[PDB]
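Run: sequence + zinc ion -> complex structure.
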Amino acid sequence: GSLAVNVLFFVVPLFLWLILQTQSDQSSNRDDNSLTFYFSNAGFFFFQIYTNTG
Amino acid sequence: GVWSNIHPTDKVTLSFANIGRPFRLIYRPEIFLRDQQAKFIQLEKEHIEKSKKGEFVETTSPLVLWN
Amino acid sequence: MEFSNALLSQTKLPGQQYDYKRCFQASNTHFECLDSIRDAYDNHHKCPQTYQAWQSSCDVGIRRYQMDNREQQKKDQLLYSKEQLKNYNAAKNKEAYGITAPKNLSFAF
Amino acid sequence: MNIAWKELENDAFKAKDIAKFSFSNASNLANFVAESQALATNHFNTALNNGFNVFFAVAGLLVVGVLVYIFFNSVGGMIIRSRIKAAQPNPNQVKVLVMPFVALGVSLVISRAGINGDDFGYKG
Amino acid sequence: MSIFSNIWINNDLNSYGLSILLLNIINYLIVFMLILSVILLTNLSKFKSLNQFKEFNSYNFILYSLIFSLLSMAGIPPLLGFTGKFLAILYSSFKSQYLLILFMTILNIFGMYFYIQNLRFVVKKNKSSILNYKNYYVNINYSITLNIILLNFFNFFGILFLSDLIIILNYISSYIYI
Amino acid sequence: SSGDLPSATLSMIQQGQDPKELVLQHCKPNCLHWEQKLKRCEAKLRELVNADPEMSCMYPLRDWVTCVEACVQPQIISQLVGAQKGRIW
Amino acid sequence: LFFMCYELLLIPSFLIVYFVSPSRRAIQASLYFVIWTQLGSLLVLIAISYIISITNTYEFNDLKYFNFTNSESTIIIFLIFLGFGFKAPIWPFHYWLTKTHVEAPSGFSIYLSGFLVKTALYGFYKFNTSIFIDIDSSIFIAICIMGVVDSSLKMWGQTDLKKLVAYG
Amino acid sequence: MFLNPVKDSEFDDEVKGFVPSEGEVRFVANKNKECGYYLQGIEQCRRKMVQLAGDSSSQFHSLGFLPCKRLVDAHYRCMTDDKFGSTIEEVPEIGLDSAQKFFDCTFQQLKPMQSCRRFFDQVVRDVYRANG
Amino acid sequence: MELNSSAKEDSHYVGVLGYPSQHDPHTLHPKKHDSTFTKVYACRDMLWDHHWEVRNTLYAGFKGALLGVAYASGFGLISKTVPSIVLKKMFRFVRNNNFGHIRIMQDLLTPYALTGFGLGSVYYLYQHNVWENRSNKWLAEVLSNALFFQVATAVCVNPGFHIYGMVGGILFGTLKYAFYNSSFFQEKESIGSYTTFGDLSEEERKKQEYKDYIQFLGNYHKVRNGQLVDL
Amino acid sequence: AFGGFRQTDNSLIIDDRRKIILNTRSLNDFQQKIYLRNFFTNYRPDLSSYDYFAFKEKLRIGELFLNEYRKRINNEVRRAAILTPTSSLREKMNHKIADQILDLSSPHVRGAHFQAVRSWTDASKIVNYVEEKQTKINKYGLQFPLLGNMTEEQCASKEDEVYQRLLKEMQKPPK
Amino acid sequence: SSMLIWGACFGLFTRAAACKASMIPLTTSPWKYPKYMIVSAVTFYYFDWYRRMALEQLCYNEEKLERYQIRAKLQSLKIGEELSDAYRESFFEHAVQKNNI
Ligand SMILES: [Zn+2]
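>> structure
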């Protein structure tokens, strides 16, 4: 087909990772939502019944 | 039912959950803790006996066991 | 292996046999000379003649097993009684028929 | 093992301490041991019984309604069904129409009564 | 295995691994004996090449029994062969051996394909007719059939009763040092 | 979420204190050979009533100090503010 | 029991594809389905064994009282992400899904796209929420976005409608 | 709770929030993790004592909750890092009211052992804020 | 059986216990009132200096060459097929030479020894100069070994198999980190051991240990959850 | 019983509190817990499991409350646009409304974002704001059906308390 | 539940499954139905006793295995750690106090 186009398609995941890294740099200095697994509910699930027996 | 009446936990969890743990601890934890708490209950008893004499001993003070 | 007294006690010289009758007679006599005076740590020097008979009658491995068993029994006696053990066993076997539930929203930790 | 009442006397402890370590009245202790400080075992048992009855009624009515609907509307093609219904006597047509709707609607009504608290006595 | 004021507390059994190995051996033997009983029901001369797994397509008992035996050998979760591998991985993680876990994972996936490859060969155009004849009629053995019934029950639902076997094996293995 | 959470442990560097004395008295076992050599040199120099001024215990002590600070210095710096590594390298 | 119930779903699916599909190519498609889904299940099993052995417990609540170090958290998150992305098809692992949809019966295809893959989203979520992970999610986000881009760029060159629905 | 009363307020009960220092949160969390054994024992001791002499006819009904006092001491010592006193009666003048609240909410009002931890933690917080 | 035992020594623990140290100065110091011959002979400490870059590179090359020679002896030469004419010429050469076998062995084993020497030297120079200061040791080992083995597979073997070279490099790096860098099955200490340094008396340590045991009691699920029945 | 994983890295650990020296690669299960797993994973680690559940619910409600503030000011802007012609809308809106719009923007109010990036002190302040509103509305008994669940018996006592409080507030002198 | 009834139910379904697998009719060789339930009921009844009695001996075995682990740990200490203050007191207890024989 096209060598240049095939190479560009091959290197797409690296391009996405690099763009995400650059925008993470942008989020870090603006104190924006970072790309992390946020842990603010201490393991409590979304709408979960938490009751006891006895 | 009759198969799972030896433990309050289901048999599958008992099989794939207690990897390398003592069966004494798994099935009769109270006796396990009491046995490993020996020489601490004696120290606590001696501490209480001394406290009956009006003297407080700083060491062995944290040894207050309820199990 | 290489660490257990049980497996080392089974190792013996060729042509070496144990007289279990005499050894157990001497051990019973010594342990009845003891157990009449009770101490946290057993003092064999308070029962000298029975101590000498026990030493001359039983092998070293048998004596080590006997001391380990005696220590375990003394530790167990100070902690448990027959009636409370029976009650605890009955309660545990009774609650084994039920299930265990999570303690949601605890306080201690 | 060492948490007991042997060798315990009020002489050692001062009155104030005793005042802050004494039992409450009989009613509070009874509610504590019975775990009935807010709700009673009678409340719980009544709620279990009501839930049992509600589930059994709802399930039975739903299954009856769907079975009668299927077995009354699954007898053939449109013309065959029309002929069968026309041949049916009036009470039979009335039943095969009404009673599946009655069963399903009663199930829904029981559920709606389950989700609504209208027994509250602070009205007016 | 910690110490507090010259009192030792241990939460490790130290004999669990031997029981796990015994369980793996016993489970493998059970599944192997299931598949060999299935083979012993039939005419033995028919199974020479690997493509001749099609010969197991005779009637629903033989076909499904061997399909489930093969799946159990491959380590498919519901069946009996999965429990031994699961407990081996659990014990390896307990002993903190991630490299051993990785190599067992590679071996397990390659062996699983090695086993399930033969499920493709079972497809046959018609019924195989792999039964011996006696008194002009096919000879169907009832005792081996009942043995396969019991082995199939414990292959399907052995995970429910695995706790008792683990208890017995740990009881046996606790005697090793004492 | 880390960074927006409270810190569980407060080291004495984070309290504005110098742990160098503790680190020195803990890095000494790493250089027992040089310390023994310095002690032997001091004992030898004490015995001689007359010695050349060129002779001194300065070099064994230099070696011992070099070893001790080789153990000590980097670990103190590694906890300071501004000594963190880069985002990638 | 969560992990066991997740694992229990494979045998009925394989049996349905093997015995009910009319197409002849479905025999190998079932094998592909089994081998990819079981590789993912093996990764999830390694993560589960890690969690169970380190914390001798089986309740989601007890995980609130135990902390995992950075290395263990990274290992667990990578393992669960890859294992659940084998079933919920992430970019590099969807060959099995394409083959299985092309060859499987229509009803089971409906069940597989509509519901079965969702079973991977649920479990991951649970294991994602019960553990504290201190890693950057950029790699996982990039993998998911690569999956989206790769799948959506391949829709033009499809003549089979079922394969097109599978790519969607 | 982390609300302070507003003084000279137009209406009766007006409050203003505040956030503790990072040191106080760290100290309370660490002590709770390191001394939760005593806290659990108080709950078990409290229930056990009533089970044995809940009736007024028992021989030791007069003693009441006395043995659990020992546990209540130990926890206090743990929560105070043994820097103030061997018993809760030796608590400084600050936090004394919170100790009375804890005792009322633990024994006189046999509340679930969820509210009672708040008052003991309040004692610890007051001591931490006062001393250093 | 130990691997990389010198680099895994805990110097503080060894010094506290009094154990001999593998980093102690193993050097020879000639003194005066000695002959001129022992001055020259005492210079052999150069070969004992593990901080000498040239010596380390030469030792790595020697190890690589030895490994290559062994591989050729066991698996390389026997698999390859030699033309009958070449074999006949070689055997005729043996007939007309007193030690002709040695020359044949040199000719057969020279390429493998040379390749092993080059690979070992390049590997040592690549590891010691590039990846020695990376924070993540496991990742550094994995990446470096993967790249090196991919390049080696491309050069020494057909370049179309470089992916398998990368996979082999990853696996080798994992194995090296597990057993050559870390210490599994080869431990010089005991798990849970510690050393005390303060001036605290036995009573203070015992009190702290009682506190530690009280805290440790909270790690039991039944104790923490309050699920114990009355004994 | 909680366990642990064997460590690999070789690094000295100095415990000045217990006056001991340990090694990371030679830590047992208990020592790993107090040396490597002691970090916090909550906004407020000092709260219990129940208390942090209440805190988390209050924080979620507070984020929704700030979003509601923004929605209310937007609806007020729409009402002003409909009711006031453009000949004077800008000046009136510039009075007291533009500042409030800019006070409830992207950083202060989460809006449509995945997560509000708050420190533990910011979360504490939001929870305190919500609790202040709750205390204001609870003393008047305004939250029975909408934000509460009381029994019939508690309703009468609450009504008596609110009636007495309203009588007390009315008879005070003005400030 | 009762193990005797569970075993009897097991034998009843085992015989019916065996009849189906052999393609022989049910209702064939009827006397094997009561025999299977009797054999299976006794078999699982004895296993219920054996599994319970194995737990008892296993628990008592771990008490002896408790002692072996402590002594194995002390004997596996690296040289020079025996007299170290971390293990000196525990080591002396077994070498001196436990010399009671
Ligand atoms: Zn030190």
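>> summary
The radius of gyration of chain J is 26 Å. Chain J touches chain E at residues 1, 3, 5-6, 28-31 (CB under 8 Å).
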